[model samples]
Target: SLHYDSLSKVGIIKGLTYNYKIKGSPSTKLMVVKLIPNIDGVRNCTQKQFDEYKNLVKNVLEPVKLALNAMLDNVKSGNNKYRFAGAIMAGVALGVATAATVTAGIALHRSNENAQAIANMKNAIQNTNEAVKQLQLANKQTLAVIDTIRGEINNNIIPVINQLSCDTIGLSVGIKLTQYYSEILTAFGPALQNPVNTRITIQAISSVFNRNFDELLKIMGYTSGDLYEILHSGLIRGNIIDVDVEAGYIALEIEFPNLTLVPNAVVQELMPISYNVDGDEWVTLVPRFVLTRTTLLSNIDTSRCTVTESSVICDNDYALPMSYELIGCLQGDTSKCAREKVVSSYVPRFALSDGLVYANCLNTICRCMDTDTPISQSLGTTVSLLDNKKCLVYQVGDILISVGSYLGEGEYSADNVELGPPVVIDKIDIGNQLAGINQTLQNAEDYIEKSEEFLK
Candidate 1:
């Protein structure tokens, strides 16, 4: 049984005598424990040796304890999202606690050099191994549920969602969510490849899921409440909201949000436009354009444009090319766009002459004439018409269109967009429910292997 002090928020296991604190945001919480030897005759060891031993124990136990608490809480709360995570944590805790006890017992036995002490150590190790085996059975059961959920999401949910003719915002959100799900699966790759480090791997996966999900919502300027409404009310919508072991799969259902109800202004603001630059994909909040010199040389309207440096104005028509070429700064900072050359086919040559050319190599943009030059060589430099940021230079017929700073792969920006009223979900615990299983440390040999890895 585990005892928790609510006042101090410390948890202690019976007979373990170790106290730990769980700290950080709910999604990224970790356990902090001080592992001082509470065993009798531990004082016989030198203080320096004891301190070193304590540090060793702390390193091994901290992550395991954190995983244990997270899993136990998931089980207690009946949350399935992290059911696998919880199981993995529980198994790791048991395995690590067993190893720590064995180490302590062996130390005491060596000091006493008695048969009774040696026998006690053996019994403790055996009992711990038994507990690990029992936990392994539970883990297998949980994994079955995870497998079913994975199948449902991969085979059923994703295909149907991908084919839906949902509105742009809904589809965009779905795409991001799907991408996040792929990331989660990718995070699991290490665990799948090397089961020995599954405990550590799951912890990382748990943190990544929480952090990424939060960031996705923030980037979209959406709250969990908004997500809930959109997921529940939409015509073709689904999100990995929560997990339920009893049901044996993750909660993924198809529905769509009411896109018609969303104002066109909000839709336009939230919509992300895709672009292909030099055969590489990029996404941005605003539409990208191919500015031909014909368009630039033609009777360019400056009526609604702001006249700035070089008597050039930034109108809606020229905003795309100017911003793309880093000729003029968007968001009312036209001064940043000031440069000797506005637009020209020889922009790269000018950049090379001024030693500030935009170079695109392997889809990575950098402000250096030499494409082979290390990116660090041009770090922290400001972007301007004279020093165009690295982007794919486009040639429309005979006219060369110099591209400016663009968003990176899988990147989206919400700057200068008016977001709707914030809606908060009180009981949102999607990532909080990520559970795990410790199938890797199911036996004594596996535990010993992990213990050796920890020592190393």
Candidate 2:
């Protein structure tokens, strides 16, 4: 027999999609925020989201709060319990408890400037659009101007918008950005202290300057993720370990003594919420999972952790180092592209061989060859940069292998190894040399094009 609970959530969960498909208002930061209460209950908003809207009004209507707090202190006095009862009765009579507050979730499209903050954003938006449209190259120039505007917004606009936190009276809140804005472009941005559609407007607009004239998207906004993505190039990929098996969730291992140094351990099936028997009173059900072979996972020991996956690898008090193989732009099996056998690490280098593995006679200027840098922790752990200039590998021991045609530590070395189609610098952003393989690519593309076009 089956039964259903009446409290089951029934509303549809259609995806909340935002296209910015049409960039609105040429000026005044065209933005709109929608709030939904109970459609069935004659109210139209999500509870958690509505709480944010309420917070905005709380900050805006300061007098109500001062009176409420003072009322609470008065009520606390023993002689005035009756007055407190009357206050509660008065509040209920005025519908404070039963009624949900309504607020402008970016809803201040107005004639006046104070409440709207800056006289109708729509008005400024119209002027900006007219200026853009008046330009002869609006189609081509508009996007670029807007992108520049967005860049300018990011540069000049963000600081001004975030200044309102000063007005909060003993209030502190944090808001998750991704969930709050329908689009990443929406700028007022979620705050860490409180989530709200509160009144926040730019304090001043700097001289209009635009840049990033050519890009897929642009907006005046700020987010921790945005800053992270921009400042750091997506050159390294890190992976977390331990996969499959239901028992693999944050379980501790008892390393069986192999060699005291080799260190081995066994894992126990004790989870935070697992069914167990007092002596032998109960049995448990089974669970399922997957694997993520990320490159950086190889570097992390048990003490290591990457994003999102902590429980599986992070054991009780003890932690282990973990790692993953760093991936570059273009790389794969080499057997198909003329194979070259590599024998002894030395014997191969002596013959002056061009291979994935190489050990050129060290240059007098080279670190190991010239000065003393205590050839650090071997192979993988030590070699920070590995690209075409140097293919870093964790071969053996504390040895970090450097496999490059030249003797550069790979700063900004371009014109790198053109052996295989093309290889990427996995982690190193700069090198002592800023060489690249553009010429080789140009040659290859030209050769392919000429032969195919001429022969055909």
Candidate 3:
């Protein structure tokens, strides 16, 4: 009744029993397993452990058995058309999953006190000829041996299982991250061209910079607003740059050419005109309309800016302080004739709450609160600033006051003051910004490494 193919695997599982009964017993009742091999350190296994070992072993062997059976069945059924052909070169993989699982089960059981002589007893009941024959048949299917099977198990499967064991939950996390990455890339395609979604896309991009650009900046030996400018200078515009990502690190080049100054806003709305009378102790009847002053330098460097079709290497200087040019233009002559120039360059005694006086304040004296300039109260969007020394939040106006730097359109004056008009004035770069695009990419690469760590 049995189709006993000559192919059968032979292996022995033995437990030793010592006759010595002096003081201590070196061994227990001896037994020989029919098909499975001997495992050194195991003894008196509990039932629960015996079953677990069986399951793990089956898990390893079942797949190969099913695959080999299908392969052979296909041959006997005339379906050989799709079967092995082209010279009918016969080959065999002597040992694959069966051998590997057998190896694993033995080692695992030997270490497990729970996986004791119980498996050996049950294993002893099975016909060695039958069980091992399947293994033999599975391996010798095409008489073709896959030399790499065992090596793959040892080199690949073991590591993968170990890594997976370290963090079973990480797969889920990785999948989610992968999903988000794919979604971002997918959505980003038309987002750039679609006007409606541009802001959203940019916000996502901004979030990336906000999250990782700082660390990247520090790594590239650059510090401190000018992020866009610095990057613009470094980038070989219209050129594709490649960055490297390895094990747990990423690298890129950071080059530079002096960058040019450009306005974040092209056409800005200048606030309507207002009068600025310098405050004084002795209020004269005929108020000094203006103080005449000459330009600070006889030859202020007015550099010329140029561009070319091939390239644009701009060499621009940092913006001058509010007074650099303002003070230079005044020649210290309080006369009616110079009133016009004076009004444009001088303002009433307007000082930010920090005690730093703003001479020009755009050539207008804020209402004499000896305080925060109220010329422009709210500018719709909230603007927060922390220049240290009396950290302040200014929404629109320039004059700093005891309120520190209060400017917000957050409702209820934002800070409880009616906020409107005196619209946004300048592009404030409050120092701590992110690095350029390279580092952002570097950060994304770093994130990949970090995710791998989490997987482990």
Candidate 4:
């Protein structure tokens, strides 16, 4: 007998199926055997032996056929000796057959175990193949389902989802806009209905304005006959444009604190008296006419100076003294200084009595007249009214000449007089107030020395 767990290698041992294993282990033996009955042997067989033969015939029929064929081939050789030898061989064959029967028993008895093992192997292989097919089908189904889901997302569900999101956002914004509109409408419901009358606000111009149209028309010089067009054209061509409108008033008054006139001064052609009667003219003139002599002085200063009383005398070691005069006066009519001296001189100085240059003060008034007022200072000496001179008697190493406030008591000249501060007498008008004046003075001295060299 033989047994195997999974695999076995078979060989004729007393012929068994086994591995390269130990000899003592259990194993299955398989053998094909023959049963032959010889002529003499069959004739001498007992009942028990015959019964065994019968059983053998039934069970081992194919083996029995093999033994009989061997015997027949032995007899057909045409030799009697060999035929008789067949009988002995046939007995040997019977012994072999018996041994084969025992060997077959070992294999046959464990046939169920071997058969079950083979069936289990075949079933496992079939199951595996089925499982593979099922896997392929399941994979196909899963892929198909995924494709369907993808199609739904791409073609149907995503667009709807996006549109729903947009609608939600739009709805939120629209609701907000509606809320603002509601608030605005409620706030200014009646205000929107009112008339819009916006005007540019005229701020405090601080100017007098006449409301009467009649007066305004009069100011613009308008009447029934409209000649303003012709006047306006004339104005545009040559007339000065006074853009500032001097709106005049009705009544006016004037006052002068210093209206004093000199006592015996000659009056002009007629007596002129004005008390600011024309208020419009007064208002215009008050601002425009400065009532100042400075205005005339300014005009005189800017005008060409030689235009007024230009005079010069040049004595150039000559037989004739050359002179030129274009004298003018502010008093165009009354001027005695130049006229009396030139046109009305004392008859060529009465034959060189110092010509016109003499102290004629005593000649005019030799004896002082005693009056109730001790004689006015002007009658005594014209020097009394002068600004920087005082009446005095002096002798300039001579027979008495007049010494007045124009000269001092001591010598008429001094060596040097410093006109500035009382300290150092070395009068130098350097810029002492500035810083670094020494450097400036040094630079100036160097420049003066260079200039002298250049001149040389």
What TM-score fits each model?
Answer: 0.16, 0.16, 0.19, 0.11
Q: What would the per-residue lDDT of candidate 2 be over residues 1-456, giving only the tens digit for each residue?
A: 100110000100111111101111222222221121111211122334546645543343343323223222221222556454322222322233212111211222121122233223323432342212221221322211121222222233244354644322112111322233323124322221122122222210111122221121232222334223221221111111111111111100111111111122222121111111111111111111111122221222322212122122321223333222121101231211111222222221111112322121121012342224432322211012223433233232223454554344434321112112223233463341233456467788999999989776
For residues 134-248, write the lDDT of model 3, one tens digit per residue.
1221221111111111112223323444355524334433343345335434542223321111123223332433323343344333447545533433331111011111110
What's the candidate order when arranged by decreasing TM-score? 3, 1, 2, 4
Q: What are the per-residue Cα lDDT tens digits for candidate 4 across 1-456? A: 111100000100011111110012222121110112212211231334545444633442333333333322221222456554222222343333444333322332334243234334333322231111111121211100011111222233234454565445344333433453344234321122211111111110001111112322232233444233212211110100011111100110011111122232211111111111112100000010001121221111211111111111111111122122111111121121121112232221101011111121212222222223222222222111111122233221123344234223423221111111112212253344344577689899999999989876
Whose lDDT is greatest here? 1
Query: Cα RMSD to native, each candidate?
Result: 30.6, 29.2, 33.3, 69.5
* Candidate 4 ranges beyond 4 A from true positions: 1-296, 299-343, 346-363, 366-382, 385-456
Cα lDDT, model 2, residue 214: 14
Q: What is the lDDT of candidate 4?
A: 0.22
**Candidate maximizing TM-score:** 3
Worst 10 residues of 3 by lDDT: 3-12
lDDT, each prediction: 0.28, 0.23, 0.27, 0.22
